[PDB]
Amino acid sequence: PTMEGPLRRKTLLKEGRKPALSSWTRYWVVLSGATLLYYGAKSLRGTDRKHYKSTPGKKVSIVGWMVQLPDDPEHPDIFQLNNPDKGNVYKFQTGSRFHAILWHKHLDDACKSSR
Amino acid sequence: PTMEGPLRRKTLLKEGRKPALSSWTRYWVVLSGATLLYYGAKSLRGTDRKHYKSTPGKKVSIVGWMVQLPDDPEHPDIFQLNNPDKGNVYKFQTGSRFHAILWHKHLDDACKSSRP
């Protein structure tokens, strides 16, 4: 894998419309090639790999997607991810600005890879 | 900084001898150049950067130190750090094998890097 770590994701737009409720969801996320694999939480607290499931609940290719880093002091650990038509848009919390920068780098490489 | 993250540290040896008391302590650790800066936890809730203090509690140069990855299925998220004479030895829990490998990479470079 290129990158792994505990992330919280919030859906801002799905199929071009705002979800009724856009709350944060805890996941262990693995970026393998240009594919994101998401592992749901086993409990309500914890950020170690063991606090998340063994089988992925979601698998998404991000080839051609776009990732952005907002440089927002109010939310220092966030990055945003959008599919090509910007109909599916997500924000991710990483726990720190450093990890937001690190994820942005690897995600940007993946979005721009050919496949 | 080259690397940052929440780590738990345990001291195995200090000045060549096992400490009387030893346990896992939570820290936000920042590798800046060849220096590790440690920020203790503000409270009991400690995963995000904001859960740790703003002023560092420890500052340690690791130039000439050695870091090791044990490849131990029993403790997949551990890496060990040793000072030059191996009198000060620590183990660190990172939460995942992936982060243990990542920290090892950056620490190994730092141990072979420059002194200010």
Coordinates of N, CA and C in Angstrom, one line a residue:
Chain A
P1 N 0.8 -1.2 0.0 CA 0.0 0.0 0.0 C 0.9 1.2 0.0
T2 N 0.3 2.3 -0.6 CA 1.0 3.6 -0.6 C 0.9 4.4 0.7
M3 N -0.3 4.3 1.3 CA -0.6 5.1 2.4 C -1.7 4.4 3.2
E4 N -1.7 4.5 4.5 CA -2.7 3.9 5.4 C -2.9 4.7 6.6
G5 N -4.1 4.7 7.2 CA -4.2 5.5 8.4 C -5.7 5.7 8.8
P6 N -5.9 6.2 10.0 CA -7.3 6.4 10.5 C -7.8 7.7 10.0
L7 N -8.9 7.7 9.3 CA -9.5 8.9 8.7 C -11.0 9.0 9.0
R8 N -11.5 10.2 9.2 CA -13.0 10.3 9.3 C -13.4 11.0 8.0
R9 N -14.5 10.5 7.5 CA -15.0 11.0 6.2 C -16.4 11.6 6.4
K10 N -16.7 12.7 5.7 CA -18.0 13.3 5.7 C -18.4 13.5 4.2
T11 N -19.6 13.1 3.9 CA -20.1 13.3 2.5 C -20.7 14.6 2.3
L12 N -20.2 15.4 1.4 CA -20.8 16.8 1.2 C -21.8 16.8 0.0
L13 N -21.5 15.9 -1.0 CA -22.4 15.8 -2.2 C -22.3 14.3 -2.6
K14 N -23.4 13.8 -3.0 CA -23.5 12.4 -3.5 C -24.5 12.5 -4.7
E15 N -24.0 12.2 -5.9 CA -24.8 12.3 -7.1 C -25.3 13.7 -7.3
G16 N -24.4 14.6 -7.0 CA -24.8 16.0 -7.1 C -25.7 16.7 -6.1
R17 N -26.1 16.0 -5.1 CA -27.0 16.6 -4.1 C -26.5 16.4 -2.7
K18 N -26.8 17.3 -1.8 CA -26.3 17.2 -0.4 C -27.1 16.2 0.3
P19 N -26.4 15.3 1.1 CA -27.1 14.2 1.8 C -28.0 14.9 2.9
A20 N -29.0 14.2 3.4 CA -29.9 14.8 4.4 C -29.0 15.1 5.6
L21 N -28.2 14.1 6.0 CA -27.3 14.3 7.1 C -25.8 14.0 6.7
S22 N -25.0 14.9 6.8 CA -23.6 14.7 6.5 C -22.7 14.8 7.8
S23 N -22.6 13.6 8.4 CA -21.8 13.5 9.7 C -20.5 12.8 9.4
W24 N -19.6 12.8 10.3 CA -18.3 12.2 10.2 C -18.5 10.7 10.4
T25 N -17.7 9.9 9.7 CA -17.7 8.4 10.0 C -16.3 8.0 10.1
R26 N -16.0 7.2 11.1 CA -14.6 6.7 11.3 C -14.2 5.5 10.5
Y27 N -13.0 5.5 9.9 CA -12.6 4.4 9.0 C -11.1 4.2 9.1
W28 N -10.6 3.1 8.7 CA -9.2 2.8 8.5 C -9.2 2.8 7.0
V29 N -8.4 3.7 6.4 CA -8.3 3.8 4.9 C -7.0 3.4 4.4
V30 N -7.0 2.6 3.3 CA -5.8 2.1 2.7 C -5.8 2.5 1.3
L31 N -4.7 3.2 0.8 CA -4.6 3.6 -0.6 C -3.7 2.5 -1.2
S32 N -4.2 1.7 -2.1 CA -3.5 0.7 -2.8 C -3.5 1.0 -4.3
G33 N -2.4 1.4 -4.9 CA -2.5 1.8 -6.3 C -3.3 3.1 -6.3
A34 N -4.4 3.1 -7.1 CA -5.3 4.2 -7.2 C -6.7 3.8 -6.6
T35 N -6.7 2.8 -5.7 CA -7.9 2.4 -5.1 C -7.9 2.6 -3.6
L36 N -9.0 3.2 -3.1 CA -9.1 3.4 -1.6 C -10.0 2.2 -1.1
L37 N -9.5 1.6 0.0 CA -10.2 0.5 0.6 C -10.5 1.1 2.0
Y38 N -11.8 1.0 2.4 CA -12.3 1.5 3.6 C -12.7 0.4 4.6
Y39 N -12.2 0.4 5.8 CA -12.5 -0.5 6.8 C -13.3 0.2 8.0
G40 N -14.5 -0.3 8.2 CA -15.3 0.4 9.3 C -14.8 0.1 10.7
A41 N -15.2 1.0 11.6 CA -14.8 0.8 13.0 C -15.5 -0.4 13.7
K42 N -14.7 -1.0 14.7 CA -15.2 -2.1 15.4 C -15.9 -1.6 16.7
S43 N -15.5 -0.5 17.2 CA -16.1 0.2 18.4 C -16.3 1.7 18.1
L44 N -16.6 2.4 19.2 CA -16.8 3.8 19.1 C -15.6 4.7 19.3
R45 N -14.5 4.1 19.7 CA -13.3 4.8 20.0 C -12.0 4.0 19.6
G46 N -11.0 4.7 19.2 CA -9.8 4.1 18.8 C -9.3 4.4 17.4
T47 N -8.0 4.6 17.3 CA -7.4 4.9 15.9 C -6.3 3.9 15.5
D48 N -6.1 2.8 16.2 CA -5.1 1.8 15.9 C -5.7 0.9 14.8
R49 N -4.9 0.3 14.0 CA -5.5 -0.6 13.0 C -6.4 -1.6 13.5
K50 N -6.1 -2.2 14.7 CA -7.0 -3.2 15.4 C -8.4 -2.7 15.8
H51 N -8.6 -1.4 15.8 CA -9.9 -0.8 16.1 C -10.8 -0.8 14.9
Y52 N -10.3 -1.4 13.8 CA -11.2 -1.4 12.6 C -11.3 -2.8 12.0
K53 N -12.3 -3.0 11.2 CA -12.6 -4.4 10.6 C -11.5 -4.9 9.7
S54 N -11.5 -6.2 9.5 CA -10.6 -6.9 8.7 C -11.0 -7.0 7.2
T55 N -12.3 -6.9 7.0 CA -12.7 -6.9 5.6 C -13.2 -5.5 5.2
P56 N -12.8 -5.0 4.0 CA -13.3 -3.6 3.6 C -14.7 -3.5 3.3
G57 N -15.4 -2.5 3.8 CA -16.8 -2.2 3.5 C -17.0 -1.4 2.3
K58 N -16.0 -0.8 1.8 CA -16.0 0.0 0.5 C -14.7 -0.1 -0.2
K59 N -14.8 0.0 -1.5 CA -13.6 0.0 -2.4 C -13.9 0.9 -3.5
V60 N -13.1 2.0 -3.7 CA -13.3 3.0 -4.7 C -12.0 3.4 -5.4
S61 N -12.1 3.3 -6.7 CA -11.0 3.8 -7.6 C -11.1 5.3 -7.7
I62 N -9.9 6.0 -7.5 CA -9.9 7.4 -7.6 C -9.1 8.0 -8.8
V63 N -9.0 7.1 -9.8 CA -8.3 7.6 -11.0 C -9.1 8.7 -11.6
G64 N -8.4 9.8 -11.9 CA -9.0 11.0 -12.5 C -9.8 11.9 -11.5
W65 N -9.8 11.5 -10.2 CA -10.5 12.4 -9.2 C -9.6 13.6 -8.9
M66 N -10.0 14.5 -8.0 CA -9.2 15.6 -7.6 C -9.2 15.8 -6.1
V67 N -8.0 16.0 -5.5 CA -7.9 16.2 -4.1 C -7.4 17.6 -3.9
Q68 N -7.9 18.2 -2.8 CA -7.6 19.6 -2.5 C -7.2 19.8 -1.0
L69 N -6.3 20.7 -0.7 CA -5.9 21.0 0.7 C -6.3 22.5 0.9
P70 N -7.3 22.7 1.7 CA -7.8 24.1 2.0 C -7.0 25.1 2.8
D71 N -5.9 24.7 3.5 CA -5.1 25.7 4.2 C -6.1 26.6 5.1
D72 N -6.9 26.0 5.9 CA -7.9 26.6 6.7 C -7.5 26.4 8.2
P73 N -7.1 27.4 8.9 CA -6.7 27.3 10.3 C -7.8 26.8 11.2
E74 N -9.0 26.9 10.8 CA -10.2 26.5 11.6 C -10.3 25.0 11.6
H75 N -9.8 24.4 10.5 CA -9.9 22.9 10.3 C -8.5 22.5 9.7
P76 N -7.5 22.5 10.5 CA -6.1 22.2 10.0 C -5.8 20.8 9.4
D77 N -6.6 19.9 9.8 CA -6.4 18.5 9.4 C -7.3 18.0 8.3
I78 N -7.8 18.9 7.5 CA -8.8 18.4 6.5 C -8.2 18.4 5.1
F79 N -8.8 17.5 4.3 CA -8.5 17.6 2.8 C -9.8 17.2 2.2
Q80 N -10.0 17.6 0.9 CA -11.3 17.4 0.2 C -11.0 16.5 -1.0
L81 N -11.9 15.6 -1.3 CA -11.8 14.7 -2.4 C -13.0 14.8 -3.3
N82 N -12.8 15.0 -4.6 CA -14.0 15.0 -5.5 C -13.9 14.1 -6.7
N83 N -15.0 13.5 -7.1 CA -14.9 12.6 -8.3 C -14.8 13.6 -9.5
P84 N -14.6 13.0 -10.7 CA -14.5 13.9 -11.9 C -15.6 14.9 -12.2
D85 N -16.8 14.5 -12.1 CA -17.9 15.5 -12.4 C -18.3 16.3 -11.1
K86 N -17.5 16.2 -10.1 CA -17.7 16.9 -8.8 C -19.1 16.7 -8.2
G87 N -19.7 15.5 -8.6 CA -21.0 15.2 -8.1 C -20.9 14.4 -6.8
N88 N -19.7 13.8 -6.5 CA -19.5 13.1 -5.3 C -18.3 13.8 -4.6
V89 N -18.5 14.5 -3.5 CA -17.5 15.3 -2.9 C -17.5 14.9 -1.4
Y90 N -16.2 14.7 -0.9 CA -16.0 14.3 0.5 C -15.0 15.1 1.2
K91 N -15.1 15.3 2.5 CA -14.1 15.9 3.3 C -13.6 14.8 4.2
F92 N -12.3 14.9 4.5 CA -11.6 13.9 5.4 C -10.9 14.6 6.5
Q93 N -11.0 14.1 7.7 CA -10.2 14.6 8.9 C -9.1 13.6 9.1
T94 N -7.9 14.1 9.3 CA -6.8 13.1 9.6 C -6.2 13.2 11.0
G95 N -6.6 14.2 11.8 CA -6.0 14.4 13.1 C -4.9 15.4 13.2
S96 N -4.3 15.7 12.0 CA -3.2 16.7 12.1 C -2.9 17.3 10.7
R97 N -2.4 18.5 10.7 CA -2.1 19.1 9.4 C -1.1 18.3 8.7
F98 N -0.1 17.8 9.4 CA 1.0 17.0 8.7 C 0.3 15.8 8.0
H99 N -0.5 15.1 8.7 CA -1.1 13.9 8.0 C -2.0 14.4 6.8
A100 N -2.7 15.5 6.9 CA -3.5 16.0 5.8 C -2.6 16.3 4.6
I101 N -1.4 16.9 4.9 CA -0.5 17.1 3.8 C 0.1 15.8 3.2
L102 N 0.4 14.9 4.0 CA 0.9 13.6 3.6 C -0.2 12.8 2.7
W103 N -1.4 12.8 3.2 CA -2.5 12.1 2.5 C -2.7 12.9 1.2
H104 N -2.7 14.2 1.2 CA -2.9 14.9 0.0 C -1.9 14.5 -1.1
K105 N -0.6 14.4 -0.7 CA 0.4 14.1 -1.6 C 0.2 12.7 -2.3
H106 N 0.0 11.7 -1.5 CA -0.3 10.4 -2.1 C -1.6 10.3 -2.8
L107 N -2.6 11.0 -2.4 CA -3.9 10.9 -3.1 C -3.7 11.7 -4.5
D108 N -3.0 12.8 -4.4 CA -2.8 13.6 -5.7 C -2.1 12.7 -6.7
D109 N -1.0 11.9 -6.3 CA -0.3 11.0 -7.2 C -1.3 10.0 -7.8
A110 N -2.1 9.4 -6.9 CA -3.1 8.4 -7.3 C -4.1 9.0 -8.3
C111 N -4.7 10.1 -8.0 CA -5.7 10.8 -8.9 C -5.1 11.0 -10.3
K112 N -3.8 11.3 -10.3 CA -3.1 11.5 -11.6 C -2.4 10.4 -12.2
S113 N -2.6 9.2 -11.7 CA -1.9 8.0 -12.3 C -2.8 7.5 -13.4
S114 N -2.2 6.8 -14.4 CA -2.9 6.3 -15.5 C -3.5 4.9 -15.4
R115 N -4.8 4.8 -15.6 CA -5.5 3.5 -15.5 C -7.1 3.7 -15.6
Chain B
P1 N 8.6 19.7 9.4 CA 9.0 18.4 10.0 C 9.0 17.3 8.9
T2 N 9.8 16.3 9.1 CA 9.9 15.2 8.2 C 8.8 14.1 8.5
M3 N 8.3 14.0 9.8 CA 7.4 13.0 10.2 C 6.8 13.5 11.5
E4 N 5.5 13.2 11.7 CA 4.7 13.5 12.9 C 3.7 12.5 13.2
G5 N 3.3 12.3 14.4 CA 2.3 11.3 14.7 C 2.1 11.0 16.1
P6 N 1.0 10.3 16.5 CA 0.8 9.9 17.9 C 1.5 8.5 18.1
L7 N 2.5 8.5 19.1 CA 3.2 7.3 19.4 C 3.1 7.0 20.9
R8 N 3.3 5.8 21.3 CA 3.4 5.4 22.7 C 4.8 4.9 22.8
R9 N 5.5 5.4 23.9 CA 6.9 5.0 24.1 C 7.0 4.2 25.4
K10 N 7.9 3.2 25.4 CA 8.2 2.5 26.7 C 9.8 2.5 26.8
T11 N 10.3 2.8 27.9 CA 11.8 2.7 28.1 C 12.2 1.3 28.6
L12 N 13.1 0.7 27.9 CA 13.6 -0.6 28.1 C 14.9 -0.6 28.9
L13 N 15.7 0.4 28.6 CA 17.0 0.6 29.2 C 17.3 2.1 29.3
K14 N 17.9 2.5 30.4 CA 18.3 3.9 30.6 C 19.6 3.8 31.3
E15 N 20.6 4.4 30.6 CA 22.0 4.4 31.1 C 22.5 3.0 31.4
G16 N 22.0 2.1 30.5 CA 22.4 0.7 30.6 C 21.7 -0.2 31.6
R17 N 20.7 0.3 32.2 CA 19.9 -0.6 33.1 C 18.4 -0.4 33.0
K18 N 17.7 -1.5 33.2 CA 16.2 -1.5 33.1 C 15.6 -0.6 34.2
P19 N 14.7 0.3 33.8 CA 14.1 1.2 34.8 C 13.3 0.4 35.8
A20 N 13.2 1.0 37.0 CA 12.4 0.4 38.1 C 11.0 0.2 37.7
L21 N 10.4 1.4 37.2 CA 9.1 1.4 36.7 C 9.1 1.7 35.2
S22 N 8.2 1.0 34.4 CA 8.2 1.1 33.0 C 6.8 0.9 32.5
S23 N 6.3 1.7 31.6 CA 5.0 1.6 31.0 C 4.9 2.3 29.7
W24 N 3.8 2.3 29.1 CA 3.6 2.9 27.8 C 3.1 4.3 28.1
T25 N 3.7 5.3 27.5 CA 3.3 6.7 27.7 C 2.9 7.3 26.3
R26 N 1.8 8.0 26.3 CA 1.3 8.6 25.0 C 2.0 10.0 24.7
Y27 N 2.4 10.2 23.5 CA 3.0 11.4 23.0 C 2.7 11.7 21.6
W28 N 2.8 13.0 21.3 CA 2.7 13.4 19.9 C 4.2 13.6 19.7
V29 N 4.7 12.9 18.6 CA 6.2 13.0 18.3 C 6.4 13.7 17.0
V30 N 7.3 14.6 17.0 CA 7.7 15.3 15.7 C 9.2 15.1 15.4
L31 N 9.5 14.7 14.2 CA 10.9 14.5 13.8 C 11.2 15.8 13.0
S32 N 12.0 16.6 13.5 CA 12.4 17.9 12.9 C 13.9 17.8 12.7
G33 N 14.3 17.6 11.4 CA 15.8 17.4 11.2 C 16.2 16.1 11.8
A34 N 17.1 16.1 12.7 CA 17.5 14.8 13.4 C 17.1 14.9 14.8
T35 N 16.1 15.8 15.1 CA 15.7 15.9 16.5 C 14.2 15.5 16.7
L36 N 14.0 14.7 17.8 CA 12.6 14.3 18.1 C 12.1 15.2 19.2
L37 N 10.9 15.8 18.9 CA 10.3 16.6 19.9 C 9.1 15.8 20.4
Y38 N 8.9 15.7 21.7 CA 7.9 15.0 22.3 C 6.9 16.0 23.0
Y39 N 5.6 15.8 22.8 CA 4.6 16.6 23.4 C 3.7 15.6 24.2
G40 N 3.6 15.8 25.5 CA 2.7 14.9 26.2 C 1.2 15.1 26.0
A41 N 0.4 14.2 26.5 CA -1.0 14.3 26.3 C -1.6 15.3 27.2
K42 N -2.6 16.1 26.7 CA -3.2 17.1 27.6 C -4.1 16.4 28.6
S43 N -4.8 15.4 28.1 CA -5.7 14.6 29.0 C -5.7 13.1 28.7
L44 N -6.9 12.6 28.8 CA -7.0 11.1 28.6 C -7.4 10.8 27.1
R45 N -7.9 11.8 26.5 CA -8.3 11.7 25.1 C -7.2 12.0 24.2
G46 N -6.5 11.1 23.6 CA -5.4 11.4 22.8 C -5.0 10.8 21.4
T47 N -5.7 11.2 20.4 CA -5.4 10.7 19.0 C -5.0 11.8 18.0
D48 N -5.6 13.0 18.1 CA -5.4 14.1 17.2 C -4.3 15.0 17.8
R49 N -3.7 15.8 16.9 CA -2.6 16.7 17.4 C -3.1 17.6 18.6
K50 N -4.3 18.1 18.5 CA -4.9 18.9 19.5 C -5.0 18.3 20.8
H51 N -4.9 17.0 20.9 CA -5.0 16.2 22.2 C -3.7 16.3 22.9
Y52 N -2.7 16.8 22.3 CA -1.3 16.9 23.0 C -0.9 18.4 23.2
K53 N 0.0 18.5 24.1 CA 0.5 19.9 24.5 C 1.1 20.7 23.4
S54 N 1.2 22.0 23.6 CA 1.8 22.9 22.6 C 3.3 23.1 22.9
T55 N 3.7 22.9 24.1 CA 5.1 23.0 24.4 C 5.7 21.7 24.6
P56 N 6.8 21.4 23.9 CA 7.4 20.1 24.0 C 8.0 19.8 25.4
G57 N 7.9 18.5 25.8 CA 8.4 18.1 27.1 C 9.7 17.5 27.1
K58 N 10.1 17.0 25.9 CA 11.4 16.4 25.7 C 11.9 16.8 24.3
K59 N 13.2 16.9 24.1 CA 13.8 17.2 22.8 C 15.1 16.4 22.8
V60 N 15.2 15.5 21.8 CA 16.3 14.6 21.7 C 16.9 14.4 20.3
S61 N 18.2 14.7 20.2 CA 18.9 14.5 18.9 C 19.2 13.0 18.7
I62 N 18.8 12.4 17.5 CA 19.1 11.0 17.3 C 20.2 10.8 16.3
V63 N 21.0 11.8 16.1 CA 22.1 11.6 15.1 C 23.0 10.4 15.7
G64 N 23.3 9.4 14.9 CA 24.1 8.3 15.3 C 23.4 7.2 16.1
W65 N 22.1 7.4 16.2 CA 21.3 6.4 16.9 C 21.0 5.3 15.9
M66 N 20.3 4.3 16.4 CA 19.9 3.2 15.5 C 18.4 2.8 15.7
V67 N 17.7 2.6 14.6 CA 16.3 2.2 14.8 C 16.1 0.8 14.1
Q68 N 15.3 0.0 14.7 CA 15.1 -1.4 14.2 C 13.6 -1.8 14.1
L69 N 13.3 -2.6 13.1 CA 11.9 -3.1 12.9 C 12.0 -4.6 13.2
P70 N 11.3 -5.0 14.2 CA 11.3 -6.5 14.6 C 10.6 -7.5 13.8
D71 N 9.7 -7.1 12.8 CA 9.0 -8.1 12.0 C 8.3 -9.2 12.9
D72 N 7.6 -8.7 14.0 CA 7.0 -9.5 15.0 C 5.5 -9.5 14.9
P73 N 4.9 -10.6 14.4 CA 3.4 -10.7 14.2 C 2.7 -10.4 15.5
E74 N 3.3 -10.7 16.6 CA 2.7 -10.5 17.9 C 2.6 -9.0 18.2
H75 N 3.5 -8.1 17.8 CA 3.5 -6.7 18.0 C 3.8 -6.1 16.6
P76 N 2.9 -6.1 15.7 CA 3.2 -5.5 14.4 C 3.5 -4.0 14.2
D77 N 3.0 -3.2 15.2 CA 3.2 -1.8 15.1 C 4.4 -1.2 15.9
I78 N 5.3 -2.0 16.3 CA 6.4 -1.6 17.1 C 7.7 -1.3 16.3
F79 N 8.5 -0.4 16.8 CA 9.9 -0.2 16.3 C 10.7 0.1 17.5
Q80 N 12.0 -0.2 17.5 CA 12.8 0.0 18.6 C 13.9 1.1 18.3
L81 N 14.2 1.9 19.3 CA 15.2 3.0 19.0 C 16.3 2.8 20.1
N82 N 17.5 2.9 19.6 CA 18.7 2.8 20.5 C 19.7 3.9 20.4
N83 N 20.2 4.4 21.5 CA 21.2 5.5 21.4 C 22.5 4.8 20.9
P84 N 23.6 5.6 20.6 CA 24.9 5.0 20.2 C 25.5 3.9 21.0
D85 N 25.5 4.0 22.3 CA 26.1 2.9 23.1 C 25.1 1.9 23.6
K86 N 23.9 1.9 23.1 CA 22.8 1.0 23.4 C 22.5 1.0 24.9
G87 N 22.8 2.1 25.6 CA 22.5 2.1 27.0 C 21.1 2.7 27.2
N88 N 20.6 3.4 26.2 CA 19.2 4.0 26.2 C 18.5 3.3 25.1
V89 N 17.5 2.5 25.4 CA 16.7 1.8 24.4 C 15.2 2.0 24.7
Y90 N 14.5 2.2 23.6 CA 13.0 2.5 23.7 C 12.2 1.7 22.7
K91 N 11.0 1.3 23.0 CA 10.2 0.7 22.0 C 9.0 1.7 21.8
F92 N 8.5 1.8 20.6 CA 7.4 2.7 20.3 C 6.3 1.9 19.6
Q93 N 5.0 2.2 20.0 CA 3.9 1.6 19.4 C 3.3 2.7 18.4
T94 N 3.0 2.3 17.2 CA 2.5 3.3 16.2 C 1.1 3.1 15.9
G95 N 0.5 2.0 16.3 CA -0.9 1.7 15.9 C -1.1 0.9 14.6
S96 N 0.0 0.8 13.8 CA -0.1 -0.1 12.6 C 1.2 -0.5 12.0
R97 N 1.3 -1.6 11.4 CA 2.5 -2.1 10.8 C 2.9 -1.0 9.8
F98 N 2.0 -0.5 9.0 CA 2.3 0.6 8.0 C 3.0 1.8 8.6
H99 N 2.5 2.3 9.7 CA 3.1 3.4 10.4 C 4.5 3.1 11.0
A100 N 4.6 1.8 11.5 CA 5.9 1.4 12.0 C 6.9 1.5 10.9
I101 N 6.6 1.0 9.7 CA 7.5 1.0 8.6 C 7.8 2.4 8.2
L102 N 6.8 3.3 8.2 CA 7.0 4.7 7.8 C 7.9 5.4 8.8
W103 N 7.7 5.2 10.1 CA 8.5 5.9 11.1 C 9.9 5.3 10.9
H104 N 10.1 4.0 10.8 CA 11.4 3.4 10.6 C 12.2 4.1 9.5
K105 N 11.5 4.3 8.4 CA 12.2 4.9 7.2 C 12.8 6.2 7.5
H106 N 11.9 7.1 8.1 CA 12.3 8.5 8.4 C 13.3 8.5 9.6
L107 N 13.2 7.6 10.5 CA 14.1 7.6 11.6 C 15.5 7.1 11.2
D108 N 15.5 6.1 10.3 CA 16.7 5.6 9.8 C 17.5 6.6 9.1
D109 N 16.8 7.4 8.3 CA 17.5 8.5 7.5 C 18.0 9.5 8.5
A110 N 17.2 9.9 9.5 CA 17.6 10.9 10.5 C 18.9 10.5 11.3
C111 N 18.9 9.2 11.7 CA 20.1 8.7 12.4 C 21.4 8.9 11.6
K112 N 21.2 8.9 10.3 CA 22.4 9.0 9.4 C 22.5 10.4 8.8
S113 N 21.7 11.4 9.4 CA 21.7 12.7 8.9 C 22.7 13.7 9.6
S114 N 22.5 15.0 9.5 CA 23.4 15.9 10.1 C 23.0 16.5 11.5
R115 N 24.1 17.0 12.2 CA 24.0 17.6 13.5 C 24.0 19.1 13.2
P116 N 23.1 19.9 13.9 CA 23.1 21.3 13.7 C 24.4 22.0 14.2

